[PDB]
Design a protein around this motif. Structure first.
Motif, short mmCIF file in Angstrom:
data_model
loop_
_atom_site.label_atom_id
_atom_site.label_comp_id
_atom_site.label_asym_id
_atom_site.label_seq_id
_atom_site.Cartn_x
_atom_site.Cartn_y
_atom_site.Cartn_z
N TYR A 26 24.33 91.44 80.21
CA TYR A 26 25.66 91.69 80.49
C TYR A 26 25.97 93.17 80.69
CZ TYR A 26 30.68 92.43 80.10
OH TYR A 26 32.17 92.69 80.43
N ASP A 52 18.26 86.99 79.17
CA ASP A 52 19.58 86.22 78.70
C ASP A 52 20.86 86.45 79.59
OD1 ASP A 52 20.91 84.70 76.30
OD2 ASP A 52 22.27 86.26 76.72
N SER A 168 26.06 78.83 71.10
CA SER A 168 26.25 80.26 70.65
C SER A 168 27.97 80.35 70.26
CB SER A 168 26.36 80.93 72.06
OG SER A 168 26.56 82.44 71.93
N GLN A 192 23.21 81.26 69.05
CA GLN A 192 23.08 82.75 69.64
C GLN A 192 24.24 83.36 69.21
OE1 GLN A 192 23.87 85.49 73.35
NE2 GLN A 192 21.87 84.14 73.52
N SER A 219 24.31 91.64 70.34
CA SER A 219 25.02 92.96 69.97
C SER A 219 24.13 93.47 69.13
CB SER A 219 26.39 93.07 69.59
OG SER A 219 27.31 92.60 70.50
N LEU A 221 22.15 95.71 69.02
CA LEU A 221 22.25 97.51 68.85
C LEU A 221 23.75 98.00 68.84
CD1 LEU A 221 19.85 97.94 71.81
CD2 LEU A 221 19.28 97.92 69.24
N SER A 223 26.49 96.46 69.98
CA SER A 223 27.32 95.79 71.10
C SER A 223 27.52 97.03 72.34
CB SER A 223 28.60 95.41 70.90
OG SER A 223 29.50 96.52 70.84
N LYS A 272 20.23 94.78 75.35
CA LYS A 272 20.52 95.00 76.70
C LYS A 272 20.27 96.67 77.00
CE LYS A 272 23.63 96.92 79.78
NZ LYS A 272 24.11 98.43 79.81
N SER A 273 19.75 96.76 77.96
CA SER A 273 19.79 98.23 78.65
C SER A 273 19.69 98.30 80.01
CB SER A 273 18.46 99.19 78.01
OG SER A 273 18.72 100.58 78.36
N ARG A 278 15.20 103.33 77.84
CA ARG A 278 15.40 102.52 76.81
C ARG A 278 14.90 101.35 77.06
NH1 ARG A 278 19.71 106.25 77.51
NH2 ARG A 278 20.96 104.83 78.65
N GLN A 281 11.44 101.80 75.96
CA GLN A 281 11.43 101.91 74.69
C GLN A 281 11.77 100.71 73.82
OE1 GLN A 281 13.98 105.37 73.14
NE2 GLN A 281 14.72 103.81 71.75
N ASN A 282 12.44 99.85 74.14
CA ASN A 282 12.75 98.78 73.26
C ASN A 282 11.65 97.55 73.01
OD1 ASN A 282 16.33 98.31 74.34
ND2 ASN A 282 15.21 99.64 72.76
N1 NAP Z 1 26.59 84.79 73.62
C1 NAP Z 1 27.59 85.84 73.44
O1 NAP Z 1 28.82 85.68 73.46
C2 NAP Z 1 27.10 87.36 73.80
C3 NAP Z 1 28.03 88.32 73.54
C4 NAP Z 1 27.43 89.42 73.88
C5 NAP Z 1 26.22 89.79 74.30
N2 NAP Z 1 25.44 88.64 74.49
C6 NAP Z 1 23.99 88.58 75.08
O2 NAP Z 1 23.32 89.64 74.27
C7 NAP Z 1 23.29 90.93 75.09
C8 NAP Z 1 23.37 92.15 74.03
O3 NAP Z 1 24.41 92.48 73.49
P1 NAP Z 1 25.23 93.53 73.93
O4 NAP Z 1 25.52 93.55 75.31
O5 NAP Z 1 26.52 93.39 73.35
O6 NAP Z 1 24.63 94.99 73.76
P2 NAP Z 1 23.47 95.41 72.54
O7 NAP Z 1 22.28 95.16 72.98
O8 NAP Z 1 23.78 95.41 71.40
O9 NAP Z 1 23.61 97.09 72.74
C9 NAP Z 1 23.45 97.61 74.08
C10 NAP Z 1 23.88 99.08 74.16
O10 NAP Z 1 22.82 99.58 73.64
C11 NAP Z 1 22.10 100.69 74.60
N3 NAP Z 1 20.96 100.81 74.22
C12 NAP Z 1 19.93 99.85 74.78
N4 NAP Z 1 18.67 100.50 74.21
C13 NAP Z 1 18.99 101.44 73.59
C14 NAP Z 1 18.15 102.58 72.96
N5 NAP Z 1 16.93 102.36 72.72
N6 NAP Z 1 18.74 103.36 72.56
C15 NAP Z 1 20.05 103.82 72.70
N7 NAP Z 1 20.94 102.85 72.97
C16 NAP Z 1 20.50 101.72 73.65
C17 NAP Z 1 22.79 100.15 76.10
O11 NAP Z 1 22.99 101.41 76.84
P3 NAP Z 1 22.06 101.55 78.10
O12 NAP Z 1 22.30 100.40 78.83
O13 NAP Z 1 22.55 102.60 78.68
O14 NAP Z 1 20.75 101.48 77.56
C18 NAP Z 1 23.89 99.40 75.73
O15 NAP Z 1 25.31 100.00 75.95
C19 NAP Z 1 24.15 90.80 76.07
O16 NAP Z 1 24.06 91.36 77.36
C20 NAP Z 1 24.05 89.38 76.37
O17 NAP Z 1 23.18 89.00 77.21
C21 NAP Z 1 25.94 87.50 74.33
#
Ligand code: NAP
Ligand code: STR
Length: 325
Positions: A26, A52, A168, A192, A219, A221, A223, A272-273, A278, A281-282
């Motif tokens: 996302y 995902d 989810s 999820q 989320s 990290l 969100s 997500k990145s 990053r 790194q992850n």
């Molecule tokens: N089922 C649901 O309702 C739902 C809801 C939300 C998400 N999801 C799924 O789960 C995924 C992840 O959740 P999320 O999108 O909320 O975000 P998340 O992964 O918690 O956080 C990602 C954020 O952290 C940054 N990041 C990534 N790696 C990093 C690192 N090593 N150091 C510092 N910052 C870092 C990213 O920026 P950069 O991109 O710039 O690295 C991005 O802005 C989604 O993309 C989606 O596939 C599902």
């Protein structure tokens, strides 16, 4: 790479294996879609084997092309990619579940998904609008029995279009409703949900474990922090001083500490990145370990901070986040 033919997986309750680190796809609306294509290719190249997405993220054409491109260039085989999609809430009616899956698959140009999830348990009216509204700007909710939604999901698995099925954003009550369903054929493999050290979901996690349902953390990290979805004054998880201190001690990063925490408590973790560095790194999450005392310190960060309330969907009984868990 000493041995990239193996990687860490967990056995799901239907016999399929899920890689324990997943790539989140996302991105906020201001980000163009060519970005998703490249980021997924980078993720695969870095050693992510779990990807995902969802119909509503509007990226599946790009995500599919990245996967097929990396199969076609020899980097990876289809069976070593675990791809998740999700059924959006305007297609919960049982008659619409399979067409929505076929539609995802057509945008992906893949024959099957590895995992299909009910994305969110509050149903809205079917149609082209992903959030249908009335003349007064009120969301048009739909009354759908999710047991009937689940049954259609079961048929998708039996037809081979989804290898595994799960949910989810389900709470304890909603998971019980599915587990006690008349004629249940397949338990959900996973739930999820949002999960990170400020919202560690221990009660929901223990319930999931008792049923051999894997909890998959999104989320993890802190969100994407995209407004209006996430409040800009919610605390920034990755500035947590305990996480930062553990990161310095380990010569890692706050993000890696947050990810490793989830692996050690039995959670499958998404990250997500869209950034090269990053992304790579992850994948370091597999290169170090936290001690019991460090895991206890991280457990102590729990503080009831839910980034994604999704309260646009509050009101109907299936809104999941008003119960305690
Ligand atoms: N089922 C649901 O309702 C739902 C809801 C939300 C998400 N999801 C799924 O789960 C995924 C992840 O959740 P999320 O999108 O909320 O975000 P998340 O992964 O918690 O956080 C990602 C954020 O952290 C940054 N990041 C990534 N790696 C990093 C690192 N090593 N150091 C510092 N910052 C870092 C990213 O920026 P950069 O991109 O710039 O690295 C991005 O802005 C989604 O993309 C989606 O596939 C599902
Ligand atoms: C990824 C995520 O947190 C989810 C939660 C609610 C979802 C949003 C629901 C409303 C919405 C309507 C659209 O037309 C674009 C997609 C969006 C903008 C969705 C993006 C995916 C969201 C933002």
């Amino acid at each position: 790479s000493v041995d990239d033919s193996k990687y860490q997986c967990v056995k799901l309750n239907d016999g399929h294996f899920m890689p324990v680190l997943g790539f989140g796809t996302y991105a906020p609306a201001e980000v163009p879609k060519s970005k998703a294509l490249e980021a997924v290719k980078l993720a695969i190249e870095a050693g992510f084997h779990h990807i995902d997405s969802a119909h509503v993220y509007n990226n599946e054409e790009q995500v599919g092309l990245a996967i097929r491109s990396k199969i076609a260039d020899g980097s990876v085989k289809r069976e070593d990619i675990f791809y998740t999609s999700k059924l959006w809430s305007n297609s919960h009616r049982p008659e619409l579940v399979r067409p929505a899956l076929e539609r995802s698959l057509k945008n992906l140009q893949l024959d099957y998904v590895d995992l299909y999830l009910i994305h969110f348990p509050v149903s809205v009216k079917p149609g082209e609008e992903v959030i249908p509204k009335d003349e007064n700007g009120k969301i048009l909710f739909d009354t759908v029995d999710l047991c009937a939604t689940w049954e259609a999901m079961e048929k998708c698995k039996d037809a081979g279009l989804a290898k595994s099925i799960g949910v989810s954003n389900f709470n304890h009550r909603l998971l019980e409703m599915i587990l006690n369903k008349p004629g249940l054929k397949y338990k959900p493999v996973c739930n999820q949900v949002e999960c990170h050290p400020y919202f560690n979901q221990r009660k929901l996690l223990d319930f999931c474990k008792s049923k051999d349902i894997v909890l998959v953390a999104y989320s993890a990290l802190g969100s994407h922090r995209e407004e209006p979805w996430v409040d800009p004054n919610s605390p920034v998880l990755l500035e947590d001083p305990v996480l930062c201190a553990l990161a310095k001690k380990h010569k890692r990063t706050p993000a890696l500490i947050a990810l490793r925490y989830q692996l050690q408590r039995g959670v499958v973790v998404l990250a997500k990145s869209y950034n090269e560095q990053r992304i790579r790194q992850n994948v370091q999450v597999f290169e170090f370990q936290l001690t019991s005392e460090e895991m206890k310190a991280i457990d102590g960060l729990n503080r009831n901070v839910r980034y994604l309330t999704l309260d646009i969907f509050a009101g109907p009984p299936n809104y999941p986040f008003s119960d305690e868990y």
